[PDB]
């Protein structure tokens, strides 16, 4: 279930990235003319959503690397089981 969970997380992160990039562009437009504004309460929305888009990109990259490690490892483990059975039947 590890690979399935990782793929679900990759899909979630991709959707979040798309939404945050759209919001960053909308904030760019609104600058020329809610609480997603970074440390504003504690322009700012544009920077916060650019940061969030970059963070989601990094998350997608890391999750994809983990997913590929898991995919390779599953192939290797499956082959190990198959060949172990074959050897024991040799």
């Amino acid at each position: 279930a590890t690979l399935r969970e990782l793929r679900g997380r990759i899909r979630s992160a991709g959707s979040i990235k798309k939404i945050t990039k759209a919001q960053e562009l909308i904030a760019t437009s609104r600058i020329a003319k809610r609480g997603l504004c970074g440390a504003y309460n504690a322009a700012s929305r544009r920077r916060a959503m650019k940061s969030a888009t970059d963070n989601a990109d990094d998350l997608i990259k890391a999750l994809t690397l983990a997913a590929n490690r898991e995919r390779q490892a599953q192939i290797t483990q499956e082959i190990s089981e198959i060949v172990g059975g074959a050897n024991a039947l040799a």
């Binding site: 279930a1 590890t2 089981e81 172990g84 059975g85 024991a88």
Partner: protein, 486 residues
Amino acid sequence: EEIGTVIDAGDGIAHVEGLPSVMTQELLEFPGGVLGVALNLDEHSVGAVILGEFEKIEEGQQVKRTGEVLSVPVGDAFLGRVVNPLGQPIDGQGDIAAETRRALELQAPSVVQRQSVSEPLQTGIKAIDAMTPIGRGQRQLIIGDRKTGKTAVCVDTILNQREAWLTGDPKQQVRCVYVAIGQKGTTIASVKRALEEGGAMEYTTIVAAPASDAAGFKWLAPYTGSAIGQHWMYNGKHVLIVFDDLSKQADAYRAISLLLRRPPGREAFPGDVFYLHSRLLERCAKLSDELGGGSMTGLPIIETKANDISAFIPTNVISITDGQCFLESDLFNQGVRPAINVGVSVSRVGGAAQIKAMKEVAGSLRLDLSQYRELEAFAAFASDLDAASKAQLDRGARLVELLKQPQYSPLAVEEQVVAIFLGTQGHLDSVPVEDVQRFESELLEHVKASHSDIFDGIRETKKLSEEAEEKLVSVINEFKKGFQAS
């Protein structure tokens, strides 16, 4: 007089030549009192699993066939004793006066030898007794990562049978078999000390296969405990057997099979590992009235790794048992103790395993809590929640607090009914969440002191009458008048 010869040996496995009339699963005597079991019978030789002290086995040694399959002594003398998978005492308290012997591989009761699970087996734990009720003859899997409180749940359940034992009535008494497979010796000693302190060794037997034991003993220990419990079950008694834990037995069986060079499967497990556990756990049954009405309730324990319930052995056992309590370390660390994941935990017997009053006050508790967890996740970042959602969230928070419970703190069934009544009938809605627990305890104490008739009615009749319910509502409101909410 057939005498075989050890033609090879190693790692707790021997290969013996001769013995043409040996049976499959027969018990074999190797010199120096060593015991083995014949598993692989082929024309060339017999593959045998040594049941301890295999370092004494040697090529050329004479092997005698005992003419009997694996069997263990059984009888009431085993109560209060620690034994090994052969029924031999290991507590140093002398011999055990066996009533008779029982073969480990006797078939489970047939479909027509049973009756539906109908009697509660109270664990004393509100979460389990209200949302995943266990009946007599049920198999409830306790599954979770390490240190999630699985042994705590099982030992509390054993301890909660002390009052039933004191009743003296076989229809009420539950005799407990605790099977320790692959555990460190001091851990078994600590479980035994906890049982002794609570007065449970009066009605508990421990079958111990510590981690030092041969893989054969760890493989056999659940079956030995099952045979001991079955002797009582077929004699009209009610039995509770805990397997702590079946993962270690599966590992021991895998070791044995790989050493016998049987072909491996998933995670190198033998093909018949599911069959091992299913044959073990279907001997827990609720017998028909014609067979005496006895029962054996199974509490297998499964340890997962990284909360991965999709591993091979957890999947097998989940598919075998009548429900499971999933324990999670995230819930544990959050203060949800017992750390039962309500959404995925379930009892496949349901209200039949509860008294009428409990079924009345807890009929929809598990579904309500599942929906509450869903809503809490969904509304985590919502800023403007409607009235209905806010009410559901507040009710769910109070219910979660209500189900929290410390270790070694059993609640009698009537007290559990009153507590769940406080919860699900809306009497906690005016209490701050952080006070719910205290409120509950105080309220119960109050009812215990000046209104014990409510408890007595629930206990005698297994029901909450309309008059008793009205009285309880009145008492709750009067108590709330004076309760001090920090």
